[PDB]
């Protein structure tokens, strides 16, 4: 049962192939078209089936050449309003039918953002880009919103001649529009069955270059270059990734760099990997983003959660993944360096949510709980923790990394519960089962909080950090002369990002503490992402109001949540900088990624 869908389940009905027509109306802000659902009963005598839906004008359903009934009922908050149609004629189990529903999306819809020329790099074209993750697929075209449906798609995208299309599969043609010569018709083909949360859609002034033999950088002109050089080691992350995981079944693995307010740090869409431009900071240190989009090529896109209460399947084996892609290329230590950092980060999330809510439980429920509102680095991290703990248990990297390819092997192109997952580990290692009983699995999978048992993770790169971390927060006024730009020398981009979390988590410090920073290190001047965040959220929860601009700025020039939403917060929390983040908010909220701008709301509580 999938609480989150209001279409039929996967045992009524499934759907097998979508085949999508529409065009890209930007002057209405619309996606007007065709969805063609190829659909398979799993029932005899099946007279209607469910599809769900959000903000979707329907105009029609044809089946068989005729207009057949259909309903729209009453909309369920977030969830949309299901669609029920009545077939035509009662159909025998394995029996399938095509179902064409001519619709048309809302200048609304939470899955898309579409851009003025003035939000672009370029400032000539508009700009249009999707994020289906999680249930947002319904606000793009009726479908059965659930993982545990499986399908392949068709897709015949009409955008301005002037623009490029580009989707979740593997480029199949352009032509010109046979119905407008100032549009052209991009077209695209997804032969691996995907959960529909995996369909997207960018439309924009893109361009590209090569990077590797099955790989294309793709942004806007003014970007192409930096994000060359930026994501040069993918392919080395895909022949690693290949080793762990098995073949590489998606044929192209392309990159495409957002324009700023993508709200997420990637997006791993099949064939193409959505990611922010924030992960271009001219040096590759946020590469691991792009070890994480490669990962769910095997861990999301090939073994898939069948609901989203089973979401940590997901995460943490892509994270657990992610990591072994950069302790290969950059050893061991720093592999314990990252999943040391992600129990910090769990650590921050108990602390946030606090340790006995639901949300910070691994499997989750999410009956009448928005998706969205639910999203933290719980998944991720305590996900990685159970995984990174059961390899310490079972023996070590090798042995559990080949419980992962085995894994991998035996659920590609399913949907599976957690269960499922706990059935197959404990037949993998039915001679250690001795050793998975000692497991409490009851705390691990459905207890809130940290978990009950913390993973042995070497010190050697984070030692550094938590001294100079220790060293700040001790000091009094006398010692703050002692500092100076040489405590940094020694310092990897990543240690100094560590360094700065390590110091957060006991924020606030002494504002002279926080100045005397800014006089020795120069934070301020630096432009990775990662590290330019925790410096201002360390300087506004230290109530140093020089910062306010800069923390205001950073919150609005991007939009990816894991920095926008903590920013806007700490600077409502701060009685200097509470107004001035509040009318940014209502200032720049139309301008805003319609989710982002919903979660932003709720944490400021503006209505
Ligand atoms: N997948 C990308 C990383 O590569 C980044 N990403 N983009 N969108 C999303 C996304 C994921 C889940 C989600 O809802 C849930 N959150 C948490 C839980 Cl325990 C269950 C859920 F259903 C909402 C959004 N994640
Ligand atoms: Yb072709
Ligand atoms: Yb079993
Ligand atoms: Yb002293
Ligand atoms: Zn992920």
Same mark, same amino acid.
């Given at each position: 049962v999938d609480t989150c869908s209001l279409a039929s389940p996967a045992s009524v009905c499934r759907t097998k192939h979508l085949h999508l027509r529409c065009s890209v109306d930007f002057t209405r802000r619309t996606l007007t078209g065709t969805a063609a659902l190829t659909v398979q009963s799993?029932?005899?005598?099946?007279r209607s089936l469910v599809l769900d839906t959000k903000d979707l004008t329907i105009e029609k359903v044809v089946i068989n050449g005729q207009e057949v009934k259909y309903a729209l009922g009453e909309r369920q908050s977030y969830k949309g309003s299901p669609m029920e149609i009545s077939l035509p004629i009662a159909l025998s189990k394995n029996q399938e039918i095509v179902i064409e529903i001519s619709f048309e999306t809302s200048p609304?819809?939470?899955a898309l953002q579409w851009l003025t020329p003035?939000?672009?790099?370029?400032?000539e074209h508009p700009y249009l880009f999707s994020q289906?993750?999680? %249930?947002?697929c319904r606000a793009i075209l009726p479908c059965?919103?659930? *993982?545990?449906v499986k399908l392949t798609y068709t897709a015949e995208v009409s955008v301005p001649k002037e623009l490029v299309a580009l989707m979740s599969a593997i480029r199949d043609g352009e032509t010109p529009d046979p119905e407008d010569p100032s549009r052209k018709i991009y077209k695209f083909i997804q032969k691996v069955p995907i959960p529909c949360y995996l369909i997207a859609l960018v439309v924009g002034a893109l361009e590209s270059r090569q990077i590797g033999p099955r790989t294309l950088v793709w942004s806007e002109k003014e970007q192409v270059e930096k994000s060359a050089y930026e994501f040069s080691e993918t392919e080395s992350m895909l022949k690693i990734a290949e080793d762990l995981g098995?073949?590489?079944?998606?044929?192209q693995y392309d990159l495409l760099v957002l324009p700023?307010?993508? *709200?997420?740090?990637?997006?791993?869409?099949?064939?193409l990997t959505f990611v922010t *431009? #924030?992960?271009?900071?001219?040096?590759?240190?946020?590469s691991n983003v792009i070890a994480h989009e490669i990962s769910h090529?095997?861990?999301?896109?090939?073994?898939?959660?069948?609901?989203?209460?089973?979401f940590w399947l997901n995460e943490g084996h892509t994270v657990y993944l992610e990591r072994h892609i950069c302790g290969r290329l950059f050893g061991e230590k720093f592999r314990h360096f990252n999943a040391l950092g992600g129990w910090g980060e769990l650590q921050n999330s108990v602390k946030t949510f606090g340790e #006995?809510? *639901?949300? #910070?439980?691994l499997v989750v429920d999410?009956?009448? %709980?928005?998706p969205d509102v639910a999203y933290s680095s719980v998944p991720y991290e305590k996900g990685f923790a159970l995984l990174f703990y059961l390899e310490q248990l079972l023996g070590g990297p090798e042995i559990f990394l080949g419980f992962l390819k085995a894994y991998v092997e035996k659920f590609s192109y399913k949907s599976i519960t957690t269960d499922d997952w706990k059935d197959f580990l404990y037949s993998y290692f039915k001679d250690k089962v001795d050793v998975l009983n000692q497991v409490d699995w009851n705390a691990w999978?459905?207890?809130?909080?940290?978990?009950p048992i913390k993973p042995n993770y070497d010190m050697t790169l984070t030692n550094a950090c938590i001294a100079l971390s220790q060293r700040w927060i001790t000091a009094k006024e006398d010692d703050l002369?002692?500092?100076?730009? #040489?405590?940094?020398?020694?310092?990897?981009s990543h240690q100094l990002n560590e360094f700065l979390a390590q110091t957060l988590q006991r924020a606030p410090l002494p504002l002279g503490h926080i100045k005397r920073m800014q006089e020795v290190?120069?934070?301020?001047? %630096?432009?990775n992402s990662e590290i330019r965040f925790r410096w201002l959220r360390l300087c506004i929860q230290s109530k140093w109001e020089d910062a306010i601009p800069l923390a205001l700025k950073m919150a609005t020039e991007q939009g990816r949540m894991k920095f926008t939403r903590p920013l806007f917060k700490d600077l409502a929390a701060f009685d200097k900088s509470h107004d001035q983040a509040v009318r940014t908010y209502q200032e720049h909220k139309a301008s805003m990624h319609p989710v982002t701008a919903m979660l932003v709301g709720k944490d400021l509580k503006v209505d």
């Open positions: 799993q029932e005899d005598n099946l609304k819809s939470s003035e939000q672009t790099s370029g400032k289906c993750q999680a %249930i947002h059965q919103d659930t *993982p545990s098995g073949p590489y079944v998606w044929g700023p307010s993508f *709200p997420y740090g990637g997006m791993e869409n099949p064939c *431009p #924030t992960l271009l900071a001219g040096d590759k240190s946020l090529s095997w861990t999301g896109n090939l073994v898939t959660n069948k609901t989203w209460d089973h #006995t809510h *639901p949300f #910070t439980k999410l009956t009448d %709980i928005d999978l459905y207890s809130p909080g940290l978990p002369n002692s500092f100076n730009a #040489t405590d940094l020398k020694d310092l990897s290190y120069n934070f301020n001047a %630096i432009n």
